[PDB]
Structure 1
């Protein structure tokens, strides 16, 4: 017999939950049965206890069970996502969003999950919108986007309406919680590959564990400077997930000849400014922003390769080649134009 007092008491006592308890809590939240005070108490208590992979897997699994899915047979087996938790506090240009366009332009199907800014000036969805991409499309039109353009974007509020009670609590309290992990774990098209950024060093392993229990090829990444992206300012920690297991490693882009950047060189601004940065990179401008875009695009291409599995180093070399070429041949610039066109034609 589950209840709020039982579950919250267990968490405040600093104990992992029994199997099924996280799922019961999440289902109460998803069906509008939880009071705002109960939602907040659960999110905070779970965060301070330190969630396990099994618990987060129950939360995400329940949340997925309530999502709008894409129509049957519309997502290719080898589709990839590129998305992070956000909340890194650094306010960069939209690296994941740029990388995703480059990846699609390299010939890899991309189905991106994303959302507006939470505490940054412009999130991926905001920048896309400022670019003229339609972010508001439902299941059928996202699947058309994917078939006709090679990329689709699932706007979280549109695909996860039942999450609205949790989302409101998240805003009211502001502090990052276990809920901040859920976006990347709940892409409603359920792609089997991903480059997944985590701002919280402690929780990246937990996210990796969740991907390990799915049929997934994923790189969960944390820049050692705190970015929820593969960084160019220093090393990054990567949890490589495949075949139900995890291989944690230290990754250094200087091994591929990247010069060290400074965080300020990756600094962003508002939607219009971050949109300008996208157009600059895709038009071929050289420098630290392109470098970081290419690095993350290659990471996603490496995750995609893990599905029909090349070894680690050769996969990276090929991913960096394909990502650079997608920019230099105009393919990425052309694909964005094509994506904007698609949205304008209804």
Structure 2
């Protein structure tokens, strides 16, 4: 029976959708069969009717069902993502991009997913990295360099109609959740930042369903990363289940920082901040990077059922600091740049 009037009516009636309806809607959007007004009505209605983990999972499933995959056996079983929803309002340095490099340098394979804004892809581009690569070359980068970056428009070309609408309406919706949930390499672990405190649990539910080992993180100051200005909320996903924790990095010797110390402007500035940290500059920015890099490593450790929380953090922090201090992180970036210049 499925139709726009039926699905929209159910949503405007403040009712959860029936199984399969969110999937039908998203597939319409992804096959160029939904009008801009229909896309917009759906995105808004699905946000104002608080979306469920099942519903958001259906949306992400449809997108992944249409995306370009990586080739068979090119993504190690233990690869990790480090990524956020964005839209925390705060023009920060790209902590996720910095932490990703550090995590890769430490020997954990990283496949990152992202897009232009300031933003993650922009900062990478300004550092000289090729953000643009197709499946076969992203697989090569992962093999040879230890990190890869899937550019969203390259892998999700059928999302362009939905992307054009998000822009036109300019307001956050349920679609802002989809980036971290639709990494086309499908890594099973991640450190995932969520700007929308109310929706982080929903994102966690989605990861739990696919039995990922993920830490979904929201700084109690609003950051879509682990913060050093105060405590963070963590939705810890492992063994298909979610528990909510408060996390205080003071317990690992981290000084309280002020939010303005993690601020960064254009792609050029954030690129300078990356070089500064990877070059060994001390300060609040390094601390944040190390903390979030450790978080990603802890998420990676969680793939093993024998993993323990506090020992995992201590080892993650040691490994993250060493990766920077030895120059490994700095040199991984240099190798990543070199890789892109050599077909």
Q: Same fold (TM over 0.5)?
A: yes
Structure 2 residue ranges without an equivalent (≥5): none
> Secondary structure at the residue paired with 1:202?
helix
Q: CA deviation at 1:215?
A: 2.7
**CA displacement 1:224-253 (0-9 Å, x = unmatched):** 010000011100000000111101100010
Inter-partner Cα distance in structure 2 for 1:331 and 1:10: 54
Between the aligned partners of 2:252 and 2:96, the Cα distance in structure 1 is: 20
What SS is found at the alignment partner of 1:153?
Answer: strand
Q: Deviations over 1:111-154 (max 9, x none)?
A: 000111xxxxx101000000000000000000000000000000
Q: Report deviation, 1:308.
A: 2.0
Q: Distance in 1 between matches of 2:39 and 2:194?
A: 23
Query: Would you say how many aligned residue pairs link Structure 1 and Structure 2?
Result: 341
SS at the partner of 1:345?
coil
CA distance in 2, matches of 1:237, 1:16: 27
TM-score if structure 2 supplies the norm length?
0.99
Residue 123 (structure 2) pairs with residue 127 (structure 1): yes
Q: Which runs of 5+ in 1 are unaligned?
A: 117-121
What's the counterpart of residue 66 of structure 1?
A: 66
Distance 2:102 2:119 in 1: 18
SS at match of 1:203: helix
CA distance in 1, matches of 2:242, 2:269: 38
The CA deviation string for residues 47-88 of structure 1, in whole angstroms up to 9 with x for no partner, is 001100000000000010000000000000000000000000
SS in structure 1 at match of 2:246: strand
Runs of 4+ aligned structure 1 residues displaced above 6 Å come to: none
Q: Give a deviation string over 1:230-280, Cα, whole Å, max 9, x none.
A: 011100000000111101100010000100111100000101110000000
Taking only aligned residues, the RMSD between alpha carbons, in angstroms, comes to 0.5
CA distance in structure 1 between the partners assigned to 2:163 and 2:247 by the alignment: 34
Q: Pick one of 304, 316, 333 that aligns with 2:313.
A: 316
Tell me, in whole angstroms, the C-alpha distance in 2 between the residues paired with 1:257 and 1:115.
34
C-alpha distance in 2 between matches for 1:68 and 1:215? 22
Say whether 1:198 aligns with 2:194: yes
Question: Which is worse superposed, 306-315 or 14-23?
Answer: 306-315
